[PDB]
Design an enzyme around this catalytic site. Structure first.
Site, short mmCIF file in Angstrom:
data_model
loop_
_atom_site.label_atom_id
_atom_site.label_comp_id
_atom_site.label_asym_id
_atom_site.label_seq_id
_atom_site.Cartn_x
_atom_site.Cartn_y
_atom_site.Cartn_z
N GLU A 1 1.49 12.43 -14.25
CA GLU A 1 0.91 12.47 -12.91
C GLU A 1 1.94 13.05 -11.95
O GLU A 1 2.99 12.45 -11.72
CB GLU A 1 0.47 11.09 -12.42
CG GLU A 1 -0.20 11.13 -11.01
CD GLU A 1 -0.44 9.75 -10.39
OE1 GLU A 1 0.36 8.83 -10.67
OE2 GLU A 1 -1.41 9.57 -9.63
N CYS B 1 -4.97 9.24 -5.56
CA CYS B 1 -4.92 8.67 -6.90
C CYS B 1 -6.04 9.25 -7.77
O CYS B 1 -5.84 9.43 -8.98
CB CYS B 1 -4.99 7.14 -6.82
SG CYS B 1 -6.37 6.45 -5.85
N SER C 1 2.88 3.90 -7.34
CA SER C 1 3.20 4.61 -8.57
C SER C 1 3.09 3.67 -9.76
O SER C 1 3.35 2.47 -9.67
CB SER C 1 4.61 5.20 -8.48
OG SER C 1 5.60 4.22 -8.70
N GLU D 1 -3.16 -1.08 -8.83
CA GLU D 1 -3.95 0.13 -8.60
C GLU D 1 -2.94 1.27 -8.68
O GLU D 1 -2.26 1.56 -7.70
CB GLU D 1 -4.63 0.07 -7.24
CG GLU D 1 -5.68 -1.01 -7.13
CD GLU D 1 -7.03 -0.52 -7.60
OE1 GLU D 1 -7.13 0.69 -7.86
OE2 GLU D 1 -7.98 -1.33 -7.70
N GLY E 1 -13.60 10.30 -4.20
CA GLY E 1 -14.65 10.03 -3.24
C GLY E 1 -15.60 8.91 -3.63
O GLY E 1 -16.82 9.07 -3.52
N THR F 1 0.84 -1.19 0.00
CA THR F 1 0.00 0.00 0.00
C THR F 1 0.88 1.24 0.00
O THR F 1 2.07 1.18 0.32
CB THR F 1 -0.98 0.00 1.19
OG1 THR F 1 -0.26 -0.09 2.43
CG2 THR F 1 -1.89 -1.21 1.09
#
Ligand SMILES: N[C@@H](CCCC(=O)O)C(=O)O
Lengths: 509, 508
Positions: A397, A300, A245, A266, A459, A162
């Site tokens: 990003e 993210c 990343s 992810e 969200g 994570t």
């Protein structure tokens, strides 16, 4: 000098934290690796220490996890659900102090740290129900006297890596689903949120131990890229869920593919908001503000590109600038603070470089752009106009509060510009046009994993699957049938008859 | 004389019960109807009193529930699930005292009383997750520029009529599911378990209060048949869930059908266990015993017919008799006790009538058959052999511990004999034969809603849908997609384009 030794932060002890904490858990606590001190990003003060995992610690923990799996996979799923229910309960009990630690060690404001713990509590409650539902269909075989059933079984050991930005919820999504699916878990968190990782593991360990379950079902090996790489290469890690990343995630995927493991990736997002001419600007402006500056731009799913129709571009940018100026900056745990520090000094460095690069590529900083002259890792939330939609920096990003603003005229081009980047996580349009909304949702619409209408890019709620496409890595977490990633499908044909009819009517005699 | 006034029953006060309790809850507590005293079936002592609903109480309660529905149906389903989660927790915190009340007023043994409250706690946990899941598919329309969505919405007011034998869990299954589906509930329980109904409603009411929600979301109108009939005839009751006897449920079904309402009928059972020659007798005998005598034979899933292959019939009977003699009888709250009283003296009379009718139709009582000589409604659990499988008394459902034993030879006949009765709730075979098991589960197997292998007919779990076919009424509760019975499906087509293409390609 450690914050945990100061009387004002004695609430930290309510999480069982001390001056120095074991960062390995596998039923026992230890840590023979380097001792890490984590720091509060709002004032650069050291909080406490965590003894990280050595390689020997990693190895023993994998073995103990796989030994624990033999017991845990034998426990009926609804009974595993009951364990996850008790984890939910134990989190509810500590939600305020755990949220406060998130605000302290990670840096996001208190409502967001509490809200992050709530996401874990909610996915726990969700997974309890799921523990009576997971499975597959019994199908009608074409062969007389044959049963056809789709079974789902645990994959075994789920390694979970994570990132710092959600040091509780991402692990929680993975852990609750993996647990009811009969897996054991091994967690390596971001080194700079080691206390959060330890504090969460302390909560889970107490539930497992109170239920006389082997603690290695939810193992912890705090460490850096060396532990993470070992997990990516480890044949014993049946599924590796990696949130982080894109650059590191791509290497994790390659390593897992090289050994025919499973990965759940992810990764990065470059999330656009699109405001059409018919949008309700009283929705657009606050939605863009929260999506862009919430968590100091370190989600993210943070809005990083804002496309505004030509007709309303100047008005929206001006309204956005007036709103940015009212953002209340301060320590993330203090009342009425909306905006805290970036998580590290390196993040401040990357913010400055991106601002510089935006100017070099022809952008104009209309709001922000500077480091704040104050203790901690504070930067101004930043708005940049005038870049072309395909400016290199705009396709990159940067995990920082920089919002690139673009003009557009028509739907087709701006949908294409949403889709042109390599990332594919979240996306949002603000419009009243019914047809446009369903086109956005359709095959020529947004290519992202999260496609929203009249709400921010961030969200999400736990009932749906969470994740993205393209360089975001393709994994899903949390709701819908995301649990299937944590289990192996079998297609099972049972001949309960005395004959052997072959599929497709084949006569072999 | 009231047990709740005696010192050893002060624990009843932990449920908020007192000497005289209000039996109407609609957000406020009331009851202008007749005052009923309920009694402990183990000793016939009065426990406490409940003021039941008058029809004016019923009328005001329906109206308050339907106004509460307008608030409750606007609350997102996940947030409704959160309320149900809290109901789960509040039951969990009262499970011991509530289970004891079930044992005191209903009369089942303490472990089953607690276990019944656990079922409600369990369905609450399950519904919480379901509250983030309920809905339908988005479908691919054949028409360009069209969306096709299956929506599900609450039906509105769900009336829940329950029986004495599961006076907590049946309501619980209906309540947890109806609530997350966006409905409000009106509960009429068995008058002889009125204290249990009040105690459950007290627990729920506190949760609704603490969450600033109208209490009428979970309304209670304690009363008898006149109230139940009012619900069956009430067009404002959008769904009537009825658990009870086949005879009453049929009239409920017809009354609801007459007004084009929705009914969910959970009715009687005449459940068979079939032991094939290859059966593990060490499984058969315990399973048959618990299935027959658990709850003193007062479950709709109770084993009432036992078919045994000729080769093993005598052995299984002899082993069942010796196991029956070891059944431990006493007060249902004593921890060692396996078998308590029937719920009513009328249950004792129906048992006696069934036993003498079995004798008159040629059967032999090989164990039990008599009322016991202690306070309460105790009868001996009973085994009858020698009847034909189509004996009149064997096809009747007597809600009492009478187990009719039959011989068989062949699989085809005993499957037919399982299916030949009017009820169709639960069924069970004991066998090791792989082919026989899937035939049992297939189209030529059991016709029941519950089809078990190597476990008794009773004791299902909440993950599956619970209910029967034929005269058992067809309703399903609890698991799988039973939730759809509490909601209305709409098939929704949204044309978001500037064209009107017609289904099937019709150029009009
Ligand atoms: N129907 C075939 C498919 C084989 C496919 C393959 O050999 O690549 C089978 O089940 O053996």
């Amino acid at each position: 000098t450690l914050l945990i030794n100061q009387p004002q932060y004695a609430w930290l002890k309510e999480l069982g934290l001390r001056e120095e904490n074991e960062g390995v858990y596998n039923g026992s606590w230890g840590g023979r690796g380097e001792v890490i001190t984590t720091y509060c990003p709002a004032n650069n003060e050291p909080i406490a220490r965590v003894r990280q995992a050595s390689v020997a610690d990693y190895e023993e923990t994998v073995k103990k996890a796989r030994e624990a799996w033999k017991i845990w996979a034998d426990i009926p799923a609804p009974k595993r659900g009951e364990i996850v229910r008790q984890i939910g309960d134990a989190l509810r009990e500590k939600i305020q102090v755990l949220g406060s630690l998130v605000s302290l060690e990670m840096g996001k404001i208190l409502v967001e740290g509490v809200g992050e713990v709530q996401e874990y509590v909610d996915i726990c409650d969700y997974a309890v129900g799921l523990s009576r539902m997971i499975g597959g269909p019994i199908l009608p075989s074409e062969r007389s006297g044959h049963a056809l059933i789709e079974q789902w079984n645990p994959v075994g050991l789920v390694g979970i890596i994570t990132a710092f930005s959600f040091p509780v919820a991402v692990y929680g999504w993975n852990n609750a689903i993996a647990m009811i699916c009969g897996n054991v878990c091994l967690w390596k968190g971001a080194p700079t949120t080691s206390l959060i990782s330890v504090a969460v593991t302390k909560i889970i360990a107490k539930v497992l131990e109170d239920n006389k379950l082997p603690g290695a079902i939810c193992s912890l090996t705090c460490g850096g890229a060396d532990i993470g790489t070992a997990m990516a290469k480890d044949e014993r890690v049946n599924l590796l869920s990696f949130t982080g990343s894109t650059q590191v995630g791509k290497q994790v995927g390659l390593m897992v593919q090289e050994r025919f493991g499973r990965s759940l990736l992810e990764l990065g997002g470059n999330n656009a908001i699109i405001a059409f001419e018919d949008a309700d600007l009283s929705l657009v402006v606050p939605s863009a503000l929260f999506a862009a500056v919430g968590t100091a731009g370190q989600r993210c799913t943070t809005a990083r590109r804002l496309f505004i129709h030509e007709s309303i571009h100047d008005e929206v940018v001006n309204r956005l600038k007036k709103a940015y100026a009212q953002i209340r900056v301060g320590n993330p745990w203090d009342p009425n603070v909306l905006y805290g520090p970036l998580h590290t000094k390196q993040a401040v460095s990357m913010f400055l470089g991106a601002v510089e690069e935006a100017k070099k590529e022809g952008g104009t900083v209309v709001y922000g752009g500077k480091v704040m002259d104050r203790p901690g890792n504070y930067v101004e939330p930043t708005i940049v106009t005038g870049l072309g939609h395909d400016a290199s920096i705009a396709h990159t990003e940067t995990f920082a509060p920089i919002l690139y603003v673009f003009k557009f005229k028509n739907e087709e081009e701006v949908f294409a510009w949403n889709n042109e980047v390599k990332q594919g996580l979240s996306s949002s349009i603000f419009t009243k046009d019914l047809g446009r909304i369903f086109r956005w949702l359709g095959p020529k619409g947004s290519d992202c994993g999260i496609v929203n209408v009249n709400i921010p890019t961030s969200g999400a709620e736990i009932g749906g699957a969470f994740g993205g496409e393209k360089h975001t890595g393709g994994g899903r977490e949390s709701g819908s049938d995301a649990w299937k990633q944590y289990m192996r499908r079998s297609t099972c044909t049972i001949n309960y008859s005395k004959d052997l009819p072959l599929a497709q009517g084949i006569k072999f005699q």
